[PDB]
Write a protein that binds this ligand. Sequence first.
Ligand SMILES: [K+]
Ligand SMILES: [K+]
Ligand SMILES: [K+]
Ligand SMILES: [K+]
Ligand SMILES: [Mg+2]
Ligand SMILES: [Mg+2]
Ligand SMILES: [Mg+2]
Ligand SMILES: [Mg+2]
Ligand SMILES: [Mg+2]
Ligand SMILES: [Mg+2]
Ligand SMILES: [Mg+2]
Ligand SMILES: [Mg+2]
Ligand SMILES: [Mg+2]
Ligand SMILES: [Mg+2]
Ligand SMILES: [Mg+2]
Lengths: 140, 140, 49, 35, 82, 82, 49, 113, 113, 136, 129, 136, 136
Amino acid sequence: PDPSIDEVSKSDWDALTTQEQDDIISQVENLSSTGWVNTSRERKAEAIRSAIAERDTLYSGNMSRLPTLDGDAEYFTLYLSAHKIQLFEGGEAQSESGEGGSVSYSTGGGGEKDLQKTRYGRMALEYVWEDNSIAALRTY
Amino acid sequence: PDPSIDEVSKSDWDALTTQEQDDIISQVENLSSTGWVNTSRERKAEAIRSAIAERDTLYSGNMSRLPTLDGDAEYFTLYLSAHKIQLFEGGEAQSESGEGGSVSYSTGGGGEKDLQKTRYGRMALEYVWEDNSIAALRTY
Amino acid sequence: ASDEEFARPTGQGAEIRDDGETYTTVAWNATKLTEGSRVTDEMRDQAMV
Amino acid sequence: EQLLEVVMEGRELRKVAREASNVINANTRVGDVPI
Amino acid sequence: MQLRRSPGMRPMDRDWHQERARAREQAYSSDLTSQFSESEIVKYELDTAQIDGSDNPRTYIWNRTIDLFGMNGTDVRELRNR
Amino acid sequence: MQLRRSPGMRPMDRDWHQERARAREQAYSSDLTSQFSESEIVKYELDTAQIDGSDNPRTYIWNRTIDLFGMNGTDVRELRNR
Amino acid sequence: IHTILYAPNGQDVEIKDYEDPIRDITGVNGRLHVDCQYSQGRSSATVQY
Amino acid sequence: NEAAINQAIELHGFPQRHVKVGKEDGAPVRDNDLRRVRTIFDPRTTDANTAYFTGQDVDVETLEAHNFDYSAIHEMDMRNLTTALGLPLEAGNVGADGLGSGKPAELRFALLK
Amino acid sequence: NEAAINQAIELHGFPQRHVKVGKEDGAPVRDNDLRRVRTIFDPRTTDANTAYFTGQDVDVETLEAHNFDYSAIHEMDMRNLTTALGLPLEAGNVGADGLGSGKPAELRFALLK
Amino acid sequence: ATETQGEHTFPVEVLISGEELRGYTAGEALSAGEPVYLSGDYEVSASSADGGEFLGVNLYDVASGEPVALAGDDCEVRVEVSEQVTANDEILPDGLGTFETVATSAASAGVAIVQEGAASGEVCEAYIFAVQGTTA
Amino acid sequence: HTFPVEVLISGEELRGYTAGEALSAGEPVYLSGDYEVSASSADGGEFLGVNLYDVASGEPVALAGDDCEVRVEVSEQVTANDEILPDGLGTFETVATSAASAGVAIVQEGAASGEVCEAYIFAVQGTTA
Amino acid sequence: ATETQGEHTFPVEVLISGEELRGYTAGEALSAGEPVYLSGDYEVSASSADGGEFLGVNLYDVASGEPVALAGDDCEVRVEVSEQVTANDEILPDGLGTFETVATSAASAGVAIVQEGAASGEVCEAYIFAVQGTTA
Amino acid sequence: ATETQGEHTFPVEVLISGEELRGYTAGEALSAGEPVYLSGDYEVSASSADGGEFLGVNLYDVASGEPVALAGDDCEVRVEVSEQVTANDEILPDGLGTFETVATSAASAGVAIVQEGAASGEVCEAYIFAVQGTTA
Ligand SMILES: [K+]
Ligand SMILES: [K+]
Ligand SMILES: [K+]
Ligand SMILES: [K+]
Ligand SMILES: [Mg+2]
Ligand SMILES: [Mg+2]
Ligand SMILES: [Mg+2]
Ligand SMILES: [Mg+2]
Ligand SMILES: [Mg+2]
Ligand SMILES: [Mg+2]
Ligand SMILES: [Mg+2]
Ligand SMILES: [Mg+2]
Ligand SMILES: [Mg+2]
Ligand SMILES: [Mg+2]
Ligand SMILES: [Mg+2]
């Protein structure tokens, strides 16, 4: 996208044109083979706006002078958006069944925390030191 | 492929022709017997672009003075790509059931973290010291 | 140190005002000057000086 | 631990020129004898 | 009134000298943002220090991966022809 | 210039003497590959040592399974008629 | 006006003579670290033609 | 033995700081990351009364000074050398139990004389 | 016994550093990988106040100086040798308990005379 | 803000007079002489361009999260103005780290009164007499 | 920005030049005036060594020459025995990739694109026409 | 490479002159005076013929995985040649443990220059002036 | 090569830096600063034009058959040139006891890099980086 998702803050997202937002939405929809096509635009927009806000507030700043967002900021914000969209659809499907057959997925004993609770969240988690607390300071 | 997946960074991938991308996509599709044929081109492109970006940012640099990406960079990036495509497909199928026919696979409790969650990720993980922290440094 | 200034006219009982000494620096960066020469042992021996 | 603390010598050449010729201890690397 | 951190007073503080001297000796580049705290850069005015890594001893020290000759740890600016 | 491992220097090295003596007392046969590390074979030139098991004391010591007479541990090359 | 001399080995200026026994050469090498700085450039005036 | 002691004193006579970074089984820390940590915890530029503030995933371990009785090795060396040269052990600035008094002293000083 | 003690001091009298690399049950480390860890922790270039910064998966262990009473072995050797040569133990720069005073001193000095 | 003396630039001493100094936490990086306002519980940030955002002036340069000393009201301060000002002018934070006059601002009341006039981009001396917050 | 650092591994061959522009640690340089060095262009007419430490324009600069072992950033994947030369981008690249037929350093530790390799500098390059 | 002196064979001292000694891992078993190239990361193995593979000559016999000392360029060396060589000939690794001339090889450039001519199988004296790697 | 100081002329000191100084027998009379190549076993003679003939520069004047000292590669030298040279020019022997640019010669590669430029018949400063022998 022309403005990239890592180049916009929460206030910038609100200032983008509908097309600039739709380009970023289209990019996020590439992270699922289903595209979350049955979820409406407003919900995908809310998830992206929230992911931008959460990046800038919870996954920003420095930690022993290392950037806390160590991976690519683009893909981190996209995976954080995908994580939110999947939670708006009720979370990970562990198993699905119907007339067309049945499937069960290797989700397993995922941890207690939100980012651990979906595959996109677990991907995003590797970009931010796996939420580890490696900060250090000294007195001069 | 003519430019190999290890020869290209995120900005290079964006600069390739559609055929140069399609050659790399076709190589990634060799890693599943199904080729993920029901997942569209844009999603395979997004997965590969993301794998390239993630290699260059999370799986780069040195430990002691050893490279962190110790295995073949080509096959690491392909397995990292296949890992992403399989998560865009919803995860590992632990079991699949159809018109009377049924199968279950030895996926098991393979782990909690991103790369542990699929077969391609578990392969990719051996290329990068299994995410171990063997770094050391000194004063002089 | 900053230049020498002036005291100011003041009323009785009025608060005195702060004109404290303020400082700056001049940086230095010592450059390595070098010179060298070589003589053979044979030349060292045979020269008059 | 016990060991032979020895080395057997190689061939040694005969050295005679200091005796068998007139020796000049020169003050300079280059010089002249007048004839 | 002047506090210890106040801009006109920094040159009087022994710590401002000691810490700027440390920063020059520790540095591996002129790119301060790579290495020093926002606190350090502000508190010690490190933009104004001539930091470049040329004062760091490890810029000049050999550290080859195999050393059969005990060369490692020697500092090249302590050689005869320096 | 010559290093300790260099081929012309090996006979000067105390360890080359001591370790060739060790190697002769270790062996049971001339088959070096069965008994020595490939490093040792090269470093101590064990091809050139007369390694054959004839210098190993264990070649000559008695070590029967059951001993009612205190025969075990006698070395045959220390008998009266040897 | 300050001439500032840095001496990593305390000696103001270091002149070393050393021999190369491999080549039979004596080298004479001099080194110094120097800078010069005004503390007050206003304390001076150039005469200009 | 003098050379061995002097070398071992430098290696083992003094404690050394071992900073360990990251959580066990957590995210890996690379060399360029440890370059920042080395700047913070640099011993060569640490005040006696420095304090440290960290998250949970930073451990400031110590390699303790690993005690060995170098004094006993010196006393043994000096005993061997002084006796070899025929001097009494006292000449080597080393004392001994019982030998400093009475008929044991009378004998060793008679032998020297 | 003198040779045995001397060699035991060389091996066991001084602590030695054992750096262990890699996580237990994790990725294996090959000889060329250890070559770079050897460069860091080389005792040949280490100094008293060197400090180390590492990930969690480098362990700096120590072989302690393994205690043995070499002094008691020397006292025994010297007691054997001096008594075998008929000299009092004191001649060997080795002390004794209770023997340095009173009639115990008078007797051994009488036997020597 | 700066005196020039030959080659040299000297920082001005910000606080002229006043005893009411108070300590706060920096919500962002700030520089000496900037007007600041409350932005969180005991947290101060640089004042925006009109009324409703002023607690005092920051006395020394800080990184985010460092402790800040303020000169509050009742203090006399050396502050840079973005426009030409005269004695008796009420002045207000400018949004640019400077002050400007009430007359130029959209607001109707100031936070400090100029005692010693200055040109645009120059150090005035002013007495801080009021704080401003969210009135809606 | 990025930071290849601690660029000297081993070697005695450091020589002094004047920086003809601002230069950075590990940057390949060539002669650009009498004893003046500037950053190398891409195709092999232009190499003398690498700059040790960051310098401003006009400052004296220490240059690691041939016979010297250095950590340098490569713009492409390299392996042991690859010959490399300046890339025109502050990096090195392989002889194989470049228009040139001869390198200036031999790679001793392999590296991925954009990473730091270890190399032995063995040659210099100038104007041949 | 051997002198004969009566009954005795003496190994020749490979390194005549030079300070350019460096240490590497043996990628295979190697013997004193063999030319070698980088077979892996700080790892050396015996050079093949026709160039692109030379870093220096091995100074002592090793098993695989041992540390190797090399004489690099800037060294003068005693080396065995597989063919007659003469002064000023450029020479190159031969693929056989020997050197041969550039003239005999398929290559266009050498790594050492012959200072002292020698017949096939004899010890030459030569100066190592270059290294060769993968140029493609 | 000579330097003028008003009234006086002085011999130019051929070597500036480097320790790669090696000994040979002169195959003919040679002059300080002349480029030379191997003409026999440890014997050097003056280089001809167009490459394949350069080991170093002769450091001091010698008659035929005398021992001679030579600066090889890794040395930094003061040398006379046949033509104008500029910083970054590669140079090699002109066959006239002096250097010319690779660009002027029939050769494709040089032996020294010019560090300080010079006019024709004048002294440049150059770093020697290669030797050239018979490749056929
Ligand atoms: K306004
Ligand atoms: K190109
Ligand atoms: K051939
Ligand atoms: K011509
Ligand atoms: Mg990182
Ligand atoms: Mg590996
Ligand atoms: Mg006043
Ligand atoms: Mg004033
Ligand atoms: Mg005469
Ligand atoms: Mg991980
Ligand atoms: Mg494994
Ligand atoms: Mg007041
Ligand atoms: Mg030499
Ligand atoms: Mg030099
Ligand atoms: Mg050289």
